[PDB]
Amino acid sequence: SLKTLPLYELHEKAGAKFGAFAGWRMPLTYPLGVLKEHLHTRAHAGLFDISHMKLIAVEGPKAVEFLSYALPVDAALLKIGQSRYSYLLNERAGILDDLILTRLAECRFMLVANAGNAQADFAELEKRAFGFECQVIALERVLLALQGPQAAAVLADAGLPGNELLFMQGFEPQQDWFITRSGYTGEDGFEIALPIGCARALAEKLLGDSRVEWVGLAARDSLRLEAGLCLHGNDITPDTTPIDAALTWAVPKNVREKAQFYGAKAFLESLQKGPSRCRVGLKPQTRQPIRAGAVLFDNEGNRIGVVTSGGFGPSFDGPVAMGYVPVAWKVEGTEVFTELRGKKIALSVHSLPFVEQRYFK
């Protein structure tokens, strides 16, 4: 009943330890281990099987107009090859999913959807497309991320194109292949989407490079959390608007002013009213991590918020977390508290990212 990765056997051969995520059986860690896999990515090149994510193609003569209604983007202004972070909003401007949109041609675009939301995102995009002369197509693909300071060199030595991309650009080097210079680590890196029948060979070719190791979901999580990146279902949900989540930067002024996207009225009203709670970085004042779901209190014991993500960051060399506090507590350095074994434990509100980003310039 958990979904199976196309490359499951490679993970089994690599000695992966498996667990459930977003309805898939995923490698959580390998024998290298959560700490060294994390550190490996920041020093070398980590290979991540992210085939649980979903590519959705959007194609047809009115793809541009459809996209500018479905999402808060000006799809006509996106240059061919350019990627943008965006989100599918509901009528109340809650975030159904966060997405990356890439223009591939005048009438062709690609979306990458999160694993847990792929089916719902596809159904909702299809309904928003009812009026438009465009098609929305869920693709069957393997998706690999190759991340770290050596990733570009590994890519070149494997004979794959992409070193010419800038950060947040993408292209199609072969029919049914899609490569982007992007990721979820705060490092330089790439994502490669390709047909399922071509994938095992590619993954074995990249792993064969002495700079490359497989990285599991645990380390994927510590990396992204150090980088200050949101995880939908933890840090953003259909109950959090981009205003609460401090993600309004993703919607440029011209798009706000045109207000043609689904959710625009609620988005604009939320922007005027201000946030109902605020996504913040949190630094536990302890060597032991505070985990997702930890309740946050003020200095008098009143419940004020919650930790949405938390773990040990090996690069930061201590616990890192993110969560929600009311606007009054969002100032950098503000003390908030949680309870552990009946003792009050302090966290301070902390800038994000925790670790400096090293995207290609």
In whole angstroms, the minimum distance from the beta carbon of 45 to Na ion comes to 9
Q: Does 58 bind Na ion (CB under 5 A)?
A: no
In whole angstroms, the minimum distance from the beta carbon of 206 to Na ion comes to 8
**Looking at 94-102, 176-184, 209-217, 320-328, which segment touches Na ion (CB under 5 A)?**
209-217
In whole angstroms, the minimum distance from the beta carbon of 354 to Na ion comes to 28
Q: Does 217 bind Na ion (CB under 5 A)?
A: no
In whole angstroms, the minimum distance from the beta carbon of 146 to Na ion comes to 11
> Quick one: 119 or 210, whose CB is closer to Na ion?
210
Does an H or E element contain 36, and which?
helix 34-43
In whole angstroms, the minimum distance from the beta carbon of 212 to Na ion comes to 4
Q: Does 145 bind Na ion (CB under 5 A)?
A: no
* Residues 154-173, interacting with Na ion (CB under 5 A): none
Q: Does 134 bind Na ion (CB under 5 A)?
A: no
> Quick one: 45 or 229, whose CB is closer to Na ion?
45
Q: Does 151 bind Na ion (CB under 5 A)?
A: no
Q: Does 45 bind Na ion (CB under 5 A)?
A: no
**Looking at 25-33, 119-127, 189-197, 207-215, which segment touches Na ion (CB under 5 A)?**
207-215
In whole angstroms, the minimum distance from the beta carbon of 149 to Na ion comes to 15
Q: Does 215 bind Na ion (CB under 5 A)?
A: no
Shortest-Cβ-distance residue relative to Na ion: 212
Q: Does 212 bind Na ion (CB under 5 A)?
A: yes
In whole angstroms, the minimum distance from the beta carbon of 152 to Na ion comes to 16
Can you give the length of the chain in residues? 361
AA identity, residue 116: G
Distance CA 271, CA 243 (A): 6
AA identity, residue 305: G
Residues of this chain that interact with Na ion (CB under 5 A) are 207, 212
